[PDB]
Design a protein around this ligand. Structure first.
Ligand code: ATP
Ligand code: ATP
Ligand code: ADP
Ligand code: ADP
Ligand code: MG
Ligand code: MG
Lengths: 592, 298, 247, 99, 91
């Protein structure tokens, strides 16, 4: 066994020393492997499967069954040897060295007569000793494999099986593929129960059953880039390591939820009293930055509360909203406020401008170019951004400025919570919040009566007419199937005169915050605030004339005073008013 | 009718009378929004293999441009992505017996389906590498809402005595047939085994769907060791509140969420509902002032 | 340990000789490195970060911590060795030349049993010795990486990771990503304050605090194709060199 | 320019920490010649490198460093840049190139 | 050769300051006639034959006009040697 041990590892010997992890619930695959191994000819099973499933675990379980003697019929006390192709190729710089080593190994296997070879990553067997291209490992092994000698077990992924192993049809012919499927949730729970003992022994901690169940469920639901048996074990191992570095301890479901939340960013951790209180008053927090628009704030708070209470649909995004309203009313401001509330910073928003999505082919920016075309390797822009941050807010600004056919791609987002890029990958939108802003039907905000002669005058609030016109315009613009998937459509009421004072206060607070960097400060009287509110009401254009007025009435004077050196750091400019009617004008005074 | 058609196709396939040169069945599910076109496909997949996750679903909204058809075949030799092969062909080859679904077929370019001809008649498809992948054991479903834009229509332009005695089903069936003939080539429609038109849902259907939606909500609650039970009056009120003959059963879902889940979230966040407790929903008031009442219970 | 010294460098020994610049404000990343390194399986951290940030700095800080400081068990008194793949594949012209050296290095590592490897400039491992007959280094290293037999730390940039490592699902599985974010203005300010002493020792000059503040702010503003924790230090070095050459 | 710098050093019109630091140029012809394979290549370079490390005040000018770096695109090319990678990482020697 | 010199000798920067190039152009038809006349004696002595000036000029013209792969200062010599061999082998 000296030459055989020089180029391989005895798996049965390792299994006799309990150096292999236990295998749970793979009876069918092991039985099929044994059944294939007993054939008269071409008894060479290969396990092809996705990376993560127990392809090597099946072979380890077969070795353990051989050690335990459970295996019946011909396979009695057989020795299973994992072949190492690296050792065979090492050195052998001269002609006839790798071939000599392989022939010696084959002769040793034939002489002993009770050796079963295992070749992990079988796709590497196509090119082994092709220094120029001719006699390699596959060409040497073909006759014995075909004639029924040299029982061999291989393992390969589907991509590697298709790309490499199928380029040599003669070699692929001599193997019987076996499908290893990803285990279901109960099977994963059983596997976790089996490996709990080993992981507790290694990590010197204790794991509860609830921890295993939570790890399995959360890994299955939230982490979608890998496969179930591995990604569930990863959470347990990470929790064990995190608990170990803190120094018997205890591992529970809360720690697993925290680990997954910090790994992926999705807030699945356990609710706290402070966080619950903050969520219950989310409307006040949103109103700390946006004045008015009660309906939209209430809808957003309701959606967030549903998401955080574990009552949202697990197959659809957290919320879908259509913010329909006039110009300068606070739609983008509300979106930024929500982004700041959720993540702590307003620049974490994913903003997409539909002003530039006018051409119908620009939809290629959403998911990328098809195969064989320029830009195919860079797959998708929206999909790439959402994939890195599964929990985020997606904003479609000015949807009426884009081609109507662009929004068809959202049909699978709002209803199924998924989007497939041109490379075949699937990105899940089940943890995002979709907002689409528009100004449809908010054009003719005037004429509180009806054209032609009327007798009663049929008075109606402007809000009701706006709501009806927005509903009609939305029904006219988008298809019925698109509007049937939107969770909420909210209309932003036009800004009132009272709100202008609070908006002025917020703008002046922002100006003071910016100015305080240079050791300064600004103070206003109620008269100045009232004058500012009166001067820039402009109910049609919103609060943009307010910014323009504040910019060209207060910023310019302070800038001129700073340039002239009138005020120095440590001064607090106080602003009052003078005159009456059209003679009302601001006056500035220094302080300290 | 759609359930009968699917069951007939499956029975014919299992009985051994299937044509060995064509797929098991080819269906065009045409109907309004929110009636159960995709739900039926998911139910069929769950009945067949083990769940709705085994379905092979393509969202044809992404095949808007005619040059995207390579996603079914792969790049020709000498082009980027040639070695990767096709995307549909590989999935079908790795699972010969499966259900293939084309969702919203009318929203793709009217040339991609030119590639389905050999699928629907010869049961085969060749990728750019020259390999033939057979489709003779698959079930092809194509969902659409063509010809359903006039369901909420009362009468046609012009004078007319009496009125159309045909129900909405017959008029919508004729409209679907006309639009299908208008949109697709005759040779493509000559290969489809069945064209099934989905009628709208009635009040009893909504009342029954209420039970399934409440069961799903109950599963979501039980995930946190809780539960929800409604009375007959509560179910009747929920059915009455959310019911639109045009928009299907999605308004019922919105009504259920607005009238139940918001209150449940508010109560859970506050602390009235805690693990180990169940909630009972009843109705109070009369006429149009009837509302819901939630009571905790161990 | 001469085999590793030929193909690499020892970090812990150099840190014991005070030959490594101090690191400031990277406790979270180094703690995450300890978290990953203590896992039973797939305990191979990889630092994904755009050029300029302290991807090597956190490794040097971890080496200094191993030399002295808070270090958990199963990681104490280890030897941190940086290995270069470029020097390993050079000089191989015949069949099996590349595999022999890597096998010898791995045998030495296993024999020592207390070595943590650092593969600087990762994503070059996918095509290491990918001849028509020779098997690449990835295929050799996969069994040990997947079973936790070999402990390694890699470093790469986000684009390199996504276009070379994410595609290979087999190799991507065995590495745990760790994000390194570009430091903010106060972080760069305190880093410059800490590093001022070494540059004052090197160039016989004196550096004022306002000079550091101006360097950081101006480098952040007027330079965009480089990144903050490096361009400010480059500006300080250039100013010191100019002052030296003037005098 | 290289010999201009050398002459400026020789007459001393050069800043401190470089006023008494010798400058040498390295050519690959001497090291390649007299060798059978790359085993002899490493011995000469390691010997001269340890010699300059012991000396500690030598600036190495390697003209045509472009050959040193880009020498892995064909068979028979000697790519010593990786060989010259580690010590430059430590920076115990100063090198000057032209390309 | 010019192509080899530009492909390989140009990149040897060490010897760029030590080598100087001198170009050699193709010979004109009168130059070819002169070379043929010069080699007449040796080639007639070797082949034991006699050749005339008309043969020289016609061989040069035929080589220049109806042959492209080879070049003038050698192919005319080749043609006359070939003809001499033909006359030698028939006796
Ligand atoms: N309700 C509000 N509360 C606070 N600030 C507001 C409000 N409405 C408007 N503003 C101010 O006016 C600015 C411009 O409004 P905003 O950008 O939100 O408009 P919008 O509704 O997105 O309109 P548009 O359709 O023109 O894009 C905001 O940045 C903010 O400073
Ligand atoms: N007949 C039905 N039985 C039970 N539930 C139904 C039925 N019809 C609709 N639903 C419910 O409504 C949801 C949405 O319906 P579904 O996705 O099946 O619509 P669709 O017919 O495919 O229409 P669309 O054209 O919008 O895609 C389903 O997930 C299900 O919860
Ligand atoms: N049936 C099973 N029973 C117990 N553990 C399993 C089983 N299948 C997979 N595993 C675990 O999954 C982990 C990864 O599997 P692995 O052997 O890497 O599969 P592959 O080699 O195909 O990637 C292993 O550590 C193993 O413990
Ligand atoms: N946290 C830190 N504390 C002190 N210095 C740092 C820190 N991060 C980076 N640096 C400095 O930045 C310089 C460049 O970093 P470098 O090691 O090149 O990172 P990378 O290799 O990822 O570009 C180093 O010389 C180092 O001194
Ligand atoms: Mg806006
Ligand atoms: Mg559908």
């Amino acid at each position: 066994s000296l030459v055989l041990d020089q180029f391989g590892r005895n798996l049965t010997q390792a299994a006799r020393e309990s150096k292999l992890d236990p295998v749970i619930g793979r009876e069918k695959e092991i039985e099929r492997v044994m059944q294939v191994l007993s054939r008269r000819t071409k008894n060479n099973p290969v396990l092809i499967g996705e990376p993560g499933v127990g392809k090597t675990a099946v072979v380890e379980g077969l070795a353990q069954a051989i050690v335990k003697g459970e295996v019946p019929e011909t396979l009695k006390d057989k020795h299973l040897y994992t072949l190492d192709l690296g050792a065979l190729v090492a050195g052998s710089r001269y002609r006839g060295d790798f071939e000599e080593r392989l022939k010696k190994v084959l002769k040793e296997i034939r002489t002993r007569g009770d050796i079963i070879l295992f070749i992990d990553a079988l796709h590497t067997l196509v090119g082994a000793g092709a220094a120029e291209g001719a006699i390699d490992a596959a060409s040497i092994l073909k006759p014995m494999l075909a004639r029924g000698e040299l029982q061999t077990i291989g393992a390969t992924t589907l991509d590697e099986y298709r790309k490499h192993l199928e380029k040599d049809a003669a070699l692929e012919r001599r193997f019987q593929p076996i499908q290893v499927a990803e285990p279901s949730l109960p099977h994963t729970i059983e596997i976790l129960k089996g490996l709990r003992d080993r992981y507790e022994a290694h990590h010197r901690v204790s794991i509860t059953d609830e921890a295993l169940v939570q790890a399995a469920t959360l890994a299955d639901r939230y982490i979608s880039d890998r496969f179930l048996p591995d990604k569930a074990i990863d959470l347990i191992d990470e929790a064990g390591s995190r608990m170990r570095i803190r120094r018997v301890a205890e591992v529970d479901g809360e720690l697993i939820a925290e680990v997954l939340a910090t790994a992926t960013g999705i807030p699945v951790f356990k609710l706290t009293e402070e966080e619950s209180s903050r969520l219950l008053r989310m409307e006040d927090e949103l109103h700390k930055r946006v004045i008015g628009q009660v309906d939209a704030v209430k809808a957003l708070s309701k959606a967030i509360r549903r998401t955080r209470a574990g009552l949202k649909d697990p197959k659809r995004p957290g919320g879908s909203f259509i913010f329909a309203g006039p110009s300068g009313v606070g739609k983008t401001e509300l979106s930024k406020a929500l982004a700041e509330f959720l993540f702590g910073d307003e620049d974490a928003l994913i903003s997409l401008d539909m002003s530039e999505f006018s051409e119908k082919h620009t939809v290629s920016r959403l998911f990328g170019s098809p195969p064989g075309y320029v830009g195919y390797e860079e797959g998708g822009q929206l999909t790439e951004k959402v994939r890195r941050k599964p929990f985020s807010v997606v904003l479609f600004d000015a949807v009426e400025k884009a081609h109507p056919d662009i929004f068809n791609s959202l049909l699978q987002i709002l209803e199924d919570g998924r989007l497939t890029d041109s490379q075949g990958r699937v990105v899940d939108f089940k943890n995002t919040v979709i907002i689409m802003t528009t100004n449809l039907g908010t054009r003719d905000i005037s004429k509180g009566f009806n054209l032609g002669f009327a007798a009663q005058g049929d008075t109606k609030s402007n809000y009701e007419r706006m709501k009806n016109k927005v509903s009609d315009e939305l029904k006219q613009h988008f298809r019925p199937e698109f509007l049937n998937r939107v969770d909420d459509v909210v209309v932003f009421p036009q800004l009132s005169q009272a709100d202008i004072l609070k908006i002025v206060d917020l703008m002046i607070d922002k100006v003071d915050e910016r100015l305080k960097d240079r050791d300064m400060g600004i103070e206003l009287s109620s008269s100045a605030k009232e004058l500012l509110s009166k001067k820039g009401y402009d109910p049609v254009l919103g609060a943009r004339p307010l910014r323009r007025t504040i910019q060209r009435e207060i910023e310019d004077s302070l800038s001129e005073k700073i340039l002239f050196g009138e005020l120095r750091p440590g001064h607090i400019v106080v602003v009052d008013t003078e005159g009456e009617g059209e003679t009302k004008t601001f006056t500035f005074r220094g302080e300290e």
